[PDB]
């Protein structure tokens, strides 16, 4: 599933976590896909969306809170947004997403 694809990304690719860095990543044309927590406030969501479209980057809307997004990336804190810099051995990039 999407989490298992995520979990592959995490253990074989490159990624950054959290608002500020995925904007650095978005500016630098580096992000290959961003994943957005169900409950991040619409304004941030709106902005990451504007940053993404300016950089021709695809967005995924994670069915679930920042609490669970962080468990999906195998981490014990919570994350509101994720940036794939490199699909590792996974295929998240070229599947449904």
């Amino acid at each position: 599933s999407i989490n298992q694809k995520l979990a592959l990304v995490i253990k074989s690719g490159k990624y950054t976590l959290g608002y500020k860095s995925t904007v650095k990543s978005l500016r630098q044309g580096k992000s290959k896909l961003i994943i957005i927590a169900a409950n991040t406030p619409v304004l941030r969501k709106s902005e990451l969306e504007y940053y993404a479209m300016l950089s021709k980057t695809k967005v995924y809307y994670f069915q679930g809170g920042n609490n669970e997004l962080g468990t999906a990336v195998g981490k014990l804190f919570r994350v509101g947004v994720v940036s794939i810099l490199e699909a590792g051995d996974s295929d998240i990039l070229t599947t449904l997403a």
């Binding site: 304004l43 709106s46 902005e47 504007y50």
Partner: protein
């Protein structure tokens, strides 16, 4: 406050001595996006009307 010069009652930004700055960051961002999404909203329903 009437006994005291204007620079003691402002900071030199938009909404100076009134709103809090991180508050004005928010206002600006939200304004821009919403004014943009407005053009987005219009062009969709201009398209709905001609594809119906």
């Amino acid at each position: 406050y009437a006994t005291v010069s204007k620079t003691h009652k402002t900071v030199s930004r938009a909404y100076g001595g009134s709103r809090c700055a991180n508050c004005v960051k928010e206002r600006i961002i939200r304004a821009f996006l919403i004014e943009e999404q407005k053009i987005v909203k219009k062009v969709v329903k201009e398209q709905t009307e001609a594809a119906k």
